[PDB]
């Protein structure tokens, strides 16, 4: 489902990996978000204008 | 300002569209790390491929 | 180190509340930054006028 | 105009104290709960208390 056999022999490391990933996640969508929001802020007050 | 409303309209697709591919592969990545330790928390070592 | 002697017997529950609890983290910390950027914008504009 | 800048200051405060507190807060429970789904993800049900 992700890797296709990709060490499951062990993976403990991959784990880790994930967590990365994880954390990686959260900056990727408060930015992200934050971006569009700031802009509807501001495309409201464009309109407004 | 129309015009900056067409260029905030830019701007608000393609920040939608990346924050929801990002999100949709890491909550994948998320879910597929949760399956890991939550089927095989070093549960291998229990199954210890005896 | 949570807690003090909290539930150990059959903590999923303990589990699911955190998760919970971490979706109201997003969903705080958004409400937060629009609110407060928003204001921000009000602010800009009183500066102005 | 300026006791509207007043209250939006200390809106503002208000505010920046709410998001700290909360995220603070929420983030040490995401640590408790990462302990637990890695330490403890039901590793407690194969120790089972048998």
Known sequence: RQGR??????????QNELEARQE??????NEGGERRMEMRQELEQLKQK | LR?????LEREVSRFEDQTQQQRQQYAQAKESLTTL??????????????
Chains 1, 3 share one sequence.
Do not use: F, G, K
């Open chain 1, 24 to 29: 990686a996640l959260s900056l990727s969508v």
């Open chain 2, 37 to 50: 330790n939550r089927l095989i928390p070093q549960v291998t070592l229990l199954l210890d491929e005896t």
């Open chain 2, 3 to 7: 015009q900056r409303h067409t260029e």
């Open chain 1, 5 to 14: 056999q990709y060490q499951a022999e062990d993976l403990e490391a991959l």
